[PDB]
Chains A and B, each alone.
Chain A
């Protein structure tokens, strides 16, 4: 109900709205500049692959 999830190519621009909250002009992965939309801050996400934190450890 919060909006459909899509991958982001990049953040094109930023602004503050009338309510003093941050909005982000998003370039959507697979779409051009015409399809760029202003999204509220809480709509942005960082995704990560599941990792085995032990593989990363360095021995000597």
Chain B
């Protein structure tokens, strides 16, 4: 099963 990942935006939008 494939892992979910993503690049985090800095600064962040909540």
Contact = CB atoms under 8 A, between A and B. Distances in A.
B13 A37 contact: yes
A45 B6 contact: yes
Contacts of B3: 7, 46-48
A6 B4 contact: no
Nearest to A4: B8
Classify chain A: how many residues form its interface, as a range: 20 to 34
B5 A4 contact: no
A10 B3 CA distance: 10
A36 B12 CA distance: 9
B14 A45 contact: no
Interface of B: 2-10, 12-14
